[PDB]
Each structure stands twice: as structure tokens, then as C-alpha cells.
């Protein structure tokens, strides 16, 4: 029975990779069938070279693969689908390399048939480190692209739009998020990676909203507090749709929720001031004093904040000794990790499709 | 477990942030190197 | 507890070695960029 040895002409090896990397597109249904066809093909070719025990050839193959991935990220880094698909490829390549490099810890939960495909001639732990570094780089680039897409979106969608219970609304943001989630689901993200990316984007949007509301005075109205809280809700049942409460995006969200509640809470009495100080733990004293200072009575009944109330707030929370930064880090990037996710796919049974045109790739 | 994990993960996160920032400057130097390659191809 | 402490210490060592290796490679890339800039100038 064929094990899947991938034989090709070494002289045109570069052609091979540019058929698998440069020429290949994520829009192809063939790769869309099982997430990771380029990754599986590259890994199986590396395994075949390991059978041939050609250190120089596998070295050249890996270097060319990394260089081509870098070139794609340079020329076509703006495309969200392309970078998502390549992140899928890198993650699956890392998982497959872990699963069958020869480290018994990875085979602790691997089938014997998969264990038969384990490489024996040599190891690639340093190659694993380089691959992980490239994965971090592509993750950062994806975060940058997502932020670039979302940057003009939030202000109009979240605050300027009046939610009813260049123009963007809350439902527009929801549709954009649903499209993104579908894109990551179809490409083959690890669900933990999905959780991390969702947490990152939620932190970004929350920080943008907080900065905008803090810098704008007219936008700061007791009336808009309900709209803000309702939008926060809409997002949280959106998360419930994907069941990602375990992800931790709500933990990124509580600063916005605390600001909204503080705005909604009455600020007449210091007995309420102490409760506000207790509840507004996430936000530093700078934002608190600023938002109290810039509060505006939208209607006649509401009144301006007393300076004595400001003094009470300042003196009560002076014990916190918070940093003097006013605005949250919009460009902050949380650290990202790649837990090993084993694949139950039968490596040998996987075959090249006719669409990819890998005729020079012979299966043995 | 939470206490010890958070105690060491503070430093873990700081080091990971430094790692990611170093990758950022590596990307910037790669862009500069590409610019230098373009300049060399100009001659 | 012992296993987690050992794993976290190993992760600390890995972070240290990665940090130092990236510092060295950053120095090398800085040297290469400076040499190319001097050649251009």
C-alpha cells in the first residue's frame, strides 16, 4: 500500500513550491475541502525526503517554503482571506511536524498507524522554532490587517449610529464579525486560536470606544449610556452564538461596561461615590476624573457634577496609585501561544487533487 | 495553581511581549533590507 | 505543583534563550543594514 512518498524533480523544486504557494489561492475548493492541503503536501514531501535521507534537499525545501511564505505575506499581506489561509497552513504544518517528528510526548496521544509515519532520520526542532517565529509574525500581521479594517468602522457603527431596539450600524459590526468568524472557521483555525483572535479584536474595539467617548464631551450623555450597554449586550449574545465566553473577551470588555455603568449611576451623594470607587476597579483614576469632569446634562433635570464630588472621588481613590496614562493602548497586542492540536487525518490516504495540477508530484 | 501560574505568567507575558516587539523590529529591518536590495538592483 | 514549576522554569529558560538569540540576530541585521547604507552613501 502506498505510504504517500512525494517524488519530484529536484532541479525544478522551486517551481514545485511556487505551484504550491505562489500559484495556489485560498479560493480553490480543493484546499477548501480539508483545511491544510498545502501543509499536508509539504509535510509529506519532507517525510519522503527523510526517507531519501537528503539533509541538503530538505534544507533547501524548508528555506524555499519560508521565503515563499514571506514573499506572499509581503505582496499579498493585505488580503484577509489569504493571510488567514496561510495561518491555517502554518498551524497545520506545525501540528503535523510535532505529531510525527519523533518526540514521544507527541505520540503519547497518537494512533499506531500515525506512529508508523514518524520520521526517524533526523529532527527539526530548530526548524520548529523558526516556524513558530514566522507564525507569530503572520499572527501580528493578521491583527494589523483586522485593526486596519475595523478602524473607521467602530466610530460610526458604535457611537455615531443611533441603535434602534460610509454609514455603519451595530448590525453592520455584527455582520462583519460573523463574516470574520466564518472565514476563520472555513480556513481551519484552531478553536483556541479563534478564541485568542476574538479576544484581541474585542479588546481593540473596546479600547477604541473608550478612547472616543473619553475624548468627546457631547458624546458623553446619560442617554447614550443605555445605548452603549445595549450594544455591549448585543456583542455578548453574539459571543453566546459562538459559545466563546471561555475565550475571555468579556474580560477585555468590563472597562467599557464600568464606564457605562458609572455614567448611568447617579453621582449626587458621596455614599454613592464610595460605591462607584469600589465598582470602577478596572478604569484608572485618570479616566474616572476626566469622565466626571466632562459629563453633560442632556436634559433639564440633570445637573452638572459638583467640584466637591470631584474632590471626594480624587481623595478616596488616591490610594490606588494608578498610572497617569489617559488612553488605552490601541496598538496593544496580547501574547499568543500555539497549543499542539493533533490531527486524526490518515496521512497516506490523502491524495493530490487534479485542480492543483501537481503532475510532477508523483505519489508512491 | 492559579497563584503560582499568575506569578510566573506575569514575567512570561512580559518576555513574550519583548519577543513580539523584537519580531516587529526584525520585520522593519527586513523592509529596510528589501529597500537596499531594490537600490542595488537600480545600479 | 512540582511538574508545573518545572515546566514554567523551562519556559523561562526558553524565553531567555530566545530573547538572547533574537538580540544577537538583531545586532547582526543592524550591522548588515548599516554596511549596506554606508555602501550606498
Amino acid at each position: 500500500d502506498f505510504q504517500g512518498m512525494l517524488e519530484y524533480k529536484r532541479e525544478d523544486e522551486q517551481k514545485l513550491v511556487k505551484n504550491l504557494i505562489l500559484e495556489l489561492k485560498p479560493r480553490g475548493v480543493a484546499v477548501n475541502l480539508i483545511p491544510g492541503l498545502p501543509a499536508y503536501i509539504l509535510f509529506m514531501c519532507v517525510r519522503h525526503a527523510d526517507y531519501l535521507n537528503d539533509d541538503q534537499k530538505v534544507r533547501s525545501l524548508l528555506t524555499s517554503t519560508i521565503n515563499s511564505i514571506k514573499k506572499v505575506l509581503k505582496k499579498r499581506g493585505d488580503d484577509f482571506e489569504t493571510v488567514s489561509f496561510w495561518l491555517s497552513n502554518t498551524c497545520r504544518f506545525l501540528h503535523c511536524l510535532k505529531q510525527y517528528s519523533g518526540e514521544e510526548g507527541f505520540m503519547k496521544h497518537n494512533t499506531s498507524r500515525q506512529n508508523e509515519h514518524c520520521l526517524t532520520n533526523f529532527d527539526l526542532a530548530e526548524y520548529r522554532q523558526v516556524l513558530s517565529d514566522l507564525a507569530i509574525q503572520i499572527y501580528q500581521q493578521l491583527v494589523r490587517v483586522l485593526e486596519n479594517i475595523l478602524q473607521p468602522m467602530i466610530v460610526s457603527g458604535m457611537l455615531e449610529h443611533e441603535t434602534i431596539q460610509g454609514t455603519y450600524t451595530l448590525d453592520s459590526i455584527l455582520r462583519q464579525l460573523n463574516s470574520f468568524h466564518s472565514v476563520m472557521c472555513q480556513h481551519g483555525m484552531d478553536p483556541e486560536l479563534i478564541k485568542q483572535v476574538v479576544k484581541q479584536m474585542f479588546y481593540i474595539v473596546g479600547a477604541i470606544t473608550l478612547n472616543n467617548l473619553l475624548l468627546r464631551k457631547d458624546m458623553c450623555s446619560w442617554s447614550k449610556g443605555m445605548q452603549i450597554r445595549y450594544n455591549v449586550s448585543q456583542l455578548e449574545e453574539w459571543l453566546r452564538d459562538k459559545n466563546l465566553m471561555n475565550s475571555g473577551a468579556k474580560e477585555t470588555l468590563e472597562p467599557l461596561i464600568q464606564a457605562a455603568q458609572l455614567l448611568q449611576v447617579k453621582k449626587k451623594t458621596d455614599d454613592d461615590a464610595e460605591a462607584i470607587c469600589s465598582m470602577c476597579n478596572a478604569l484608572t483614576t485618570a479616566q474616572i476624573v476626566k469622565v466626571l469632569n466632562l459629563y453633560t446634562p442632556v436634559n433639564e433635570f440633570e445637573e452638572r457634577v459638583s467640584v466637591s464630588f470631584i474632590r471626594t472621588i480624587q481623595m478616596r481613590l488616591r490610594d490606588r496609585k494608578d498610572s497617569p496614562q489617559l488612553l488605552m493602548d490601541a496598538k496593544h497586542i496580547f501574547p499568543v501561544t500555539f497549543p499542539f492540536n493533533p490531527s486524526s487525518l490518515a496521512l497516506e490516504t490523502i491524495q493530490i487533487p487534479a485542480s492543483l495540477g501537481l503532475g510532477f508530484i508523483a505519489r508512491v | 495553581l492559579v497563584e503560582e501560574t499568575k506569578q510566573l505568567e506575569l514575567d512570561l507575558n512580559d518576555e513574550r511581549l519583548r519577543y513580539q516587539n523584537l519580531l516587529n523590529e526584525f520585520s522593519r529591518l527586513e523592509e529596510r533590507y528589501d529597500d537596499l536590495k531594490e537600490e542595488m538592483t537600480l545600479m | 505543583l512540582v511538574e508545573e514549576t518545572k515546566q514554567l522554569e523551562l519556559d523561562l529558560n526558553d524565553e531567555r534563550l530566545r530573547y538572547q538569540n533574537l538580540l544577537n540576530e538583531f545586532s547582526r541585521l543592524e550591522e548588515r543594514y548599516d554596511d549596506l547604507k554606508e555602501e550606498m552613501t
Binding site: 539533509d55 530538505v58 532520520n121 533526523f122 527539526l124 523558526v130 | - | -
Partner: peptide, 12 residues
């Protein structure tokens, strides 16, 4: 040669 890459050989 931007990244120094080495290949460890497994000892069977």
C-alpha cells in the same frame, strides 16, 4: 542566510 538554520540528526 537571514536566519541561521541547522538540521539536528536523530540518533537511532
Amino acid at each position: 542566510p537571514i536566519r541561521p538554520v541547522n538540521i539536528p540528526r536523530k540518533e537511532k
